[model samples]
Every structure is written in structure tokens, then in C-alpha cells.
Target: NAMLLGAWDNAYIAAAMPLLLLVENIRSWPTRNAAEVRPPIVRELQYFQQHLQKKNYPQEDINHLSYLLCTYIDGIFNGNQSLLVEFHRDAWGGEDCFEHLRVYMNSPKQYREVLEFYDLIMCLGFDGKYQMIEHGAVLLMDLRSRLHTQLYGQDATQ
Candidate 1:
């Protein structure tokens, strides 16, 4: 990556964050026979909106959803070039990244049932590459262990 953290731990996990969200959102939206679309597909706004309305979902959930969706959307749009390049070119970069990071943090535990729904993907066979839930688990484990190191100033092995 163009950006490297102290040990390539946090930066790698964080870079992976958007792709994870893209793949997850790809699999879960409309959530009714959803997960079938790819990056360039025109997202179904109405279907996504219905999901928000029907579930009486919370703002935290909405922000998390937006975090994943918007990142993927923005990434896809700017991929002929770099979104980060375009982003830093703007004044909103500072404020936007902070709000975006806040939303992503909400992705975990901000909604218990949603976290459980992540487990539901397992029943979907999670049997293919894009469907490989194992990678997601590993990424999370890496984040946890690295965060432990970040907080405690040592690796898990320490």
C-alpha cells in the first residue's frame, strides 16, 4: 500500500476494511435473493431503503450500512483513478474520514442481531471465494490480536 503503518498491521486490516464491506454488502442487501450483484451494478436504492424502513433499523445500523455502501460506491466510481487522491484534493477529507470511521466502528456490536446475521452467511454455504467467510474471520482475528498489541504494546504471543 502507499500508506504503511508501523508494522503493516493496522493499515493492511484497514485497507481490507472497504473490500470486506463491499463483499458483505454485495451478499446481504435486499437480502432477498441478494448478494448477486457486483461492484459496477447500479445499486437498487428502493430495495435498500425498504430494508432500512422494514427493520426499524437504528441510525447506527444505517451509518454502518452507508459506510460499506458508500465506500464501495465511491471506490468504484473513482477507480479509473484513486478516490483517496480525489478525497485529499478536497476540503471535506478531514471531516468525512472521521465520520466514516465512526460509522465503521458501529459495524461491530452496534447491533447484536446484525452481528448474528453475519453468522447466517455460514448457512449460505459460504462455499465460494467471494462467499468465503473464513477470510473475514481471519481478518477480524488479526485485527483483534493487533489491536491487543496496539493497546498493550505487544503482540498476542508476548
Candidate 2:
């Protein structure tokens, strides 16, 4: 019963990319066969690592981004109030709104699945006021689509 308060698109998705990874990690913990669940996460890590190395960013900069991603995701998911505030303020709400609605309308099979995932996202948030998932499922889906796009080299951001 989390309320979707502000805009659906939040700045947190990108800043909280590690949250996605951590969630993926937990989701696949029961099944140690990472080939199925871990490859996407591992590839993301590799992408970041390679980007950092190839770009020649300063060591301090790389560490800072890493710490920022890790700590912010960790703090928010672990119920750190201050970090949660920071997450919502910096990432959770975004510019895109109503996109989820269109996405839901267009996908008959996904409609139920989206609602289920949306409920989980709402229930997980301690505040329940920032119901980003309830309103921003499209945002999450968009990110996943982008990941797919990267994997398949096609635009999947529907």
C-alpha cells in the first residue's frame, strides 16, 4: 500500500545501479549457477571496470564512484534513513511520468507481472511514500531494456 507520491522517473535508478546488482545477487543466491543469473550482473561490473580502466579516470575518481554506488545502494536497501533520503532526493524520482501506464497497456502478458513486482518494490521501501516502483515500473523496465539493448545491440526501450 505504498503511495506513489512524486514523479515516476527518479534520478535514483542510475545512481543506484548497484541496487539492481545487489537485488540480482540476492535473487540468485539460492541458485549458485550464476551462468543464468550472474552473467548480466558480472557483465555490468566488467563494463564499469573496463570503462574505468580504459577511460583513464583517476584512481580516486573511480573509487569515489564505486563507493558512492555501493554505499548508497547498501544504505538505502538496508534501511539507512539518511541514505534513503539521499537516494530519493538524488535518484528515485525522475523526469519520465506516465510511461509505465503506456507500457502496461501495451503488454498484456506483462500487466500482471508488473503489478506483482510493483507491489514488492512498494513493500520493500520502509517509508512507503516514495513508491517509485508503483509509479515507475516503466523506469525499471526501461533500464532493463537498455541492458538488453546492450546485450542484443537493439533498441528495447519501449
Candidate 3:
């Protein structure tokens, strides 16, 4: 069963296996009541909700974005191309350039950024998963000019 956690890649196995064991141990701790036990993903979502609340994000917006992030990441993991297409249609005017977004957020080319992202996740525990959404949003903002150029071609001001 734990082998499935290596589906992402062999490299992930080195980290994912230990994390899976850690989660299992946490869930099985004696002090924790059966009623208090929840799936790690559900706990991660609650953490994301609290993080957004601390930032004073509007509750409705947080709800929408959290749902989108969960759906988007799930699609990426499950090879749901149609979901990605729909996301691009709704968010980027059919640009379909989110392959770049995925790579940047999930596997940054810059060594320093990759290390920093890894460190943040390990330090923040499961809550750091939501940080990917923040990073993706920042990347989109950074790429706005390029996205406009891609859409408008010569019409976009240089």
C-alpha cells in the first residue's frame, strides 16, 4: 500500500515514505480519540482554512480558492487534462500555458527556490501544501505581461 505513494517518482519515495509513516503514527497515537482522527488531507484543508483566516482573506473567496486548489492539484495527479483545460478557459482566456505554471510551482528550475520551497513545507508540516497555491498565484501575476503577449501577439505593447 505504501508503494503507491511512490507514484509521483522514485525520488519522492525517499521523502514520501517517511512522511506517510509519520502521518500514520500521528493518527494512531494513544491520546487521540477515534472521533478526533481525520484523514491527513482533511487536516491539511483545515490548516489551509485557518491560514487564510489569519491573513484576513474573505471567507467566500477562501472557500472558492481552496476548492479550486484541491481540484487543480487532484487533476494534476490523476491526469485529468479536461479539468486543466477548463481551468485555463475560466482563468486564462484559453491560453493553455499552465504547463509552465505546473512546472514552476511543482518543480522549480532554480535550485535555491526549490530548496526554499522544500524547507518551507517540511517546517510548516501539512499546511505548506496550501503555499503552492500562493506561489502559483504569484507566478501568474509575474507572467501577466507574457500571458498578454501570448494572447495579443503584436497588439501587446513591448
Name the top TM-score candidate. Answer: 1
Candidate 1 lDDT at 152 equals 37
Candidate 2 lDDT by residue in tens digits, 46-133: 4554565675645543433333333333434343222323323443322221243235435634443333333234334312222345
CA-lDDT, candidates in order: 0.38, 0.38, 0.38
Instruction: Point out the higher-scoring one by lDDT: 1 or 2.
Output: 2
Q: CA lDDT of 115 in candidate 3?
A: 27
Kindly provide the TM-score of model 2 when superposed on the true structure, using C-alpha atoms: 0.27
Off by over 4 Å in 1: 1-43, 80-110, 113-158
Off by over 4 Å in 2: 1-39, 80-158
**Model 3: residue 100 alpha-carbon error in angstroms:** 20
lDDT of 1 at 118: 26
Compared with the true structure, the alpha-carbon lDDT of candidate 1 equals 0.38
